[PDB]
Scaffold this active site. Structure first.
Site, PDB file in Angstrom:
ATOM      1  N   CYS A 166      43.373  33.033  46.229  1.00  0.00           N
ATOM      2  CA  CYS A 166      42.313  34.195  45.537  1.00  0.00           C
ATOM      3  C   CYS A 166      41.536  34.668  46.695  1.00  0.00           C
ATOM      4  O   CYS A 166      41.805  34.841  48.279  1.00  0.00           O
ATOM      5  CB  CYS A 166      41.744  33.308  45.142  1.00  0.00           C
ATOM      6  SG  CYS A 166      42.309  32.510  43.760  1.00  0.00           S
ATOM      7  N   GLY A 203      44.620  29.592  48.261  1.00  0.00           N
ATOM      8  CA  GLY A 203      44.258  30.051  49.384  1.00  0.00           C
ATOM      9  C   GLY A 203      44.825  31.585  49.255  1.00  0.00           C
ATOM     10  O   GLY A 203      43.490  32.675  50.154  1.00  0.00           O
ATOM     11  N   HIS A 228      34.450  32.421  42.001  1.00  0.00           N
ATOM     12  CA  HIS A 228      34.897  30.999  42.173  1.00  0.00           C
ATOM     13  C   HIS A 228      34.317  30.599  43.252  1.00  0.00           C
ATOM     14  O   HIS A 228      34.655  29.677  43.370  1.00  0.00           O
ATOM     15  CB  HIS A 228      35.437  30.221  41.372  1.00  0.00           C
ATOM     16  CG  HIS A 228      37.215  31.309  41.245  1.00  0.00           C
ATOM     17  ND1 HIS A 228      37.719  32.254  41.126  1.00  0.00           N
ATOM     18  CD2 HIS A 228      38.038  30.756  42.418  1.00  0.00           C
ATOM     19  CE1 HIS A 228      38.470  32.527  41.781  1.00  0.00           C
ATOM     20  NE2 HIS A 228      38.688  31.429  42.579  1.00  0.00           N
TER      21      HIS A 228
END
Ligand SMILES: *[C@](O)(C(=O)NCc1ccccc1)[C@H](C[C@@H]1CCNC1=O)NC(=O)[C@H](CC1CC1)n1cccc(NC(=O)OC(C)(C)C)c1=O
Ligand SMILES: *[C@](O)(C(=O)NCc1ccccc1)[C@H](C[C@@H]1CCNC1=O)NC(=O)[C@H](CC1CC1)n1cccc(NC(=O)OC(C)(C)C)c1=O
Lengths: 306, 306
Positions: free
Chosen positions: B145, B143, B41
């Protein structure tokens, strides 16, 4: 989202761990620039441990009595010296992985990460607080002496603890990196007692702010308190006195949540008097005291290191 | 002695963390050899998040759209590919600090260390269990991920988790490093909820054994229970059924302490039914279920990694 007891990344300290052997004793040492730091009782035999004369024992040692290994490499010892309860072994090679660092002596209530090591090899990492009786609640076995505690600020490692010994009921004692013990303890195999421990009030308040930030609000009441009236109750439950410095330190968290510090103290006062009634806060059924105000801000705002 | 929740030393993983920017989205990637792994993503806008057609979105992306930084060194992306929910960015430079590694899919009830990162810089480390509802109780901010979960065996890093999302109970979900989600979760902006979760009985027993080994033994009693009678009580409290394989897996801890599993189960049944009466076990006022039998053996025997 979420709140966890969190250690610093340990890579910068892993690169400094070596193994120090003197005679029959193997423990860990910290390799910074061209110096290895380790507990001075590496020179003791089991007989020496009961009442060691360290200055006399060290005269009997030579540079080559110290076998220092960094992974699969032997480092040559070219000089040695005692500083309080640590030895400093000068070696002919500087550690290429030496991070930016300093040595600090921390204050009770402050937290740090421990890299538990055995035979110069890192084993695990966990967070500890220096308690007001100058012990820490660690996880240390035979061979862990010389493991260090530290904080990281950006790229700078502040070393604050080196592990030396176990005290009754499973708590631990050690020195700063200048070899001065935290607390009244001595590096001798004799019976030693720690003072009665107390709860770190400013840290409990920080953790209650962490709870509000993470959506746990049920303990907030509609009252405020004076500092004096709070401390009257806190002392009755073996809590450390809260100072105006502590109130001031909690300022940023109280701005972040809109809950005045003395309002949070009034909620803590109710928790101490009535208990938790079987409910949890941040997944704990007791009041947690090993998160500093800075630990809370750091975790809830995402401060990073490199 | 002493028993602490303990993460693996993180340095082997720290040397693999990079920052991946695509358009306005920045998150973390895992750099092994000449491939950087990150959540797919990263290519989405917030507008894309509602129902993203990842195949079509990726076709429109240039290698030049992927800005990868390792420290202050930019890595040139020379190829990209999609595998389930992870993006694989081929880069011009192979990671010189690539450890020996495997990709493994962990089983519910097992633990791993999370290295929380922001902008490709490690920020903290902590232990998580894969719950039976396929969530983890992490600490993750905007932030995070691309942060990964791992175990270390000797010198081999077994990567098992990559972080993707947060859920409306304060818990977290992600994938294995082949990009397959743990649990029924999907990488799009839709309403998602953690299923009902059960307490990991074998881990509670392992932690009670940890307590005995460390001398916290007040909850032991002279009584024993059958396996079926224990499970009758356990099921009522939403504990996972204890199988004969669980009893077998506890064999090393049972042998170390001399306390048979069905003897320990009588302690656990009493603790479930009558509570702790204001006492603690290893400093907890509730029954901890995120230590595996291996975690206890590892910590109490002191095995080491490198
Ligand atoms: C540290 O020296 C070490 O790790 N040494 C290497 C090694 C030791 C033994 C066998 C193989 C290799 C240990 C660390 C201790 C071990 C268990 N948990 C720890 O934290 N430190 C000591 O053993 C310490 C040395 C003394 C200060 C100079 N020591 C010696 C003897 C007894 C105790 N403690 C103790 O018995 O406490 C009570 C409460 C009385 C049980 C001790 O710390
Ligand atoms: C992860 O994508 C990430 O960190 N991306 C980089 C970035 C994001 C935001 C701002 C700057 C940079 C995040 C990780 C989340 C963020 C906060 N804590 C976390 O663990 N993941 C998501 O935002 C995730 C992306 C989806 C899987 C593909 N996502 C999207 C939409 C909604 C949620 N969840 C949510 O809304 O949860 C509640 C509890 C309802 C707020 C979600 O995780």
């Amino acid at each position: 989202s979420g709140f966890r007891k969190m250690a610093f990344p340990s890579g910068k300290v892993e690169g400094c761990m070596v193994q120090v052997t003197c005679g029959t004793t193997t423990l860990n040492g910290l390799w910074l620039d061209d110096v290895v730091y380790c507990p001075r009782h590496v020179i003791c035999t089991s007989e020496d441990m009961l009442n060691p004369n360290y200055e006399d024992l060290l005269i009997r040692k030579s540079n080559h009595n110290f076998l220092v290994q960094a992974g699969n490499v032997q480092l040559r010892v070219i000089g040695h010296s005692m500083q309080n309860c640590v030895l400093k072994l000068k070696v002919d090679t500087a550690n290429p992985k030496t991070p930016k660092y300093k040595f600090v002596r921390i204050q009770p209530g402050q937290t740090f990460s421990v890299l538990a090591c055995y035979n110069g090899s890192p084993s695990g990492v966990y967070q500890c607080a220096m308690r007001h009786n100058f012990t820490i609640k660690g996880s240390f076995l035979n061979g862990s002496c010389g493991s260090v505690g530290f904080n990281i600020d950006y790229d700078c490692v502040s070393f604050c603890y080196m592990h030396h010994m176990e005290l009754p009921s499973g708590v631990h004692a050690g020195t700063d990196l200048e070899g001065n013990f935290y607390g009244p303890f001595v590096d001798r195999q004799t019976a030693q007692a720690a003072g009665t421990d107390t709860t770190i009030t400013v840290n409990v308040l920080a953790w209650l702010y962490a709870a509000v930030i993470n959506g746990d609000r049920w303990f907030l009441n509609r009252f405020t308190t004076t500092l004096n009236d709070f401390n009257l109750v806190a002392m009755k439950y073996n809590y450390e006195p809260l100072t105006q410095d502590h109130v001031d330190i909690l300022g940023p968290l109280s701005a972040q949540t809109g809950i005045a510090v003395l309002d949070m103290c009034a909620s803590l006062k109710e928790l101490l008097q009535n208990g938790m009634n079987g409910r949890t806060i941040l997944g704990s059924a007791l009041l947690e005291d090993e998160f500093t105000p800075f630990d809370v801000v750091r975790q809830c705002s995402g401060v990073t290191f490199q």
